[PDB]
Amino acid sequence: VLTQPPSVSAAPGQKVTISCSGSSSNIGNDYVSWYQQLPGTAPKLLIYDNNKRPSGIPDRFSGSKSGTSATLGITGLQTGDEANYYCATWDRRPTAYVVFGGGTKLTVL
Amino acid sequence: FEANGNLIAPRYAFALSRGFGSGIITSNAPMDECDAKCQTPQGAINSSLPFQ
Amino acid sequence: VQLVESGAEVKKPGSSVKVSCKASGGPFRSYAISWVRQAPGQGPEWMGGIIPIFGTTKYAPKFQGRVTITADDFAGTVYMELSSLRSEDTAMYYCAKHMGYQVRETMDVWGKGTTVTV
Ligand SMILES: *[C@@H]1O[C@H](CO)[C@@H](O)[C@H](O)[C@H]1NC(C)=O
Ligand 1 contacts CB of residue B32 (under 6 A): no
Atom 6 in ligand 1: which residue has the minimum CA distance? B35
* Domains in chain A, number: 1
Measure the CA–CA gap between B43 and B31, rounded to whole angstroms.
Answer: 10
C-beta B36 within 6 A of ligand 1: yes
CATH of residue A34's domain is 2.60.40.10
Q: What is the DSSP string of C8-34?
A: -EE--TT--EEEEEEESSSSS-SS-EE
DSSP string, C28-49: S-SS-EEEEEE-TTS-EEEEEE
Strands B38-39 and A44-47: unpaired
Greatest alpha-carbon pair distance for chain B in Å reads: 63
Task: Measure B46 CA to ligand 1 centroid, in angstroms.
Answer: 6
CB atoms within 10 A of CB A33: 25
The distance of C3 to chain B (nearest Cα, Å) reads 19
Cβ distance C104 to A90 less than 8 Å, yes or no, reads: yes
Where would I find the H helices in chain C?
none
Strand A104-108 to A7-10 pairing:
parallel
- Is residue A27 a contact partner of residue A70, using CB atoms and an 8 Å limit? yes
| Terminal alpha carbon distance of chain C | 31
Q: Given strand C3-5, what is the order of strands in its sheet?
A: C3-5, C17-23, C77-82, C67-72
Distance from the Cα of C8 to chain B's closest Cα (Å) equals 22
Distance B34 CA to ligand 1 centre (A): 7
User: What DSSP designation does C88 have?
Assistant: G
Query: Which residues form the domain of A30?
Result: 1-109
Q: Which residues pair with C114 in a beta bridge?
A: C93
User: Chains with ≥3 Cβ pairs under 8 A against C?
Assistant: A, B
What is the 3-state composition of chain A as percent helix, strand, coil, each rounded to the nearest 5?
0, 50, 50
Q: Chain A 10-69, CB below 8 Å of chain C: which residues?
A: 30-33, 42-45, 48-49, 54
- Sort residue C30 into left (φ over 0), alpha (ψ -120 to 50) or beta: alpha
**What's the B47 CA to ligand 1 centre distance in angstroms?**
10
* A20 contacts A75 by C-beta, under 8 angstroms: no
Q: How many CB pairs under 8 A join B and C?
A: 7
Alpha carbon A15 to its chain centroid, in Å, reads 14
Burial class (CB in 10 A: 0-12, 13-18, 19+), B23: exposed
Instruction: With beta carbons less than 8 A apart as the criterion, state whether A36 and A18 touch.
Output: no
Q: Is the CB of B35 under 6 A from ligand 1?
A: yes
Contact A48, A39 (CB under 8 A): no
A99 touches chain C (CB under 8 A): yes
- Whether C103 sits inside 8 A of A31 (CB atoms) is no
Among candidate residues C98, C95, C107, the one with its CA nearest the CA of residue A33: C107
Q: Look at the alpha carbons of B39, B44, B45, B51 in this order and tell me if their dihedral is positive or negative.
A: negative
Q: 3-class SS at C89?
A: helix
Give the span between the Cα atoms of A54 and C2, in whole angstroms: 17
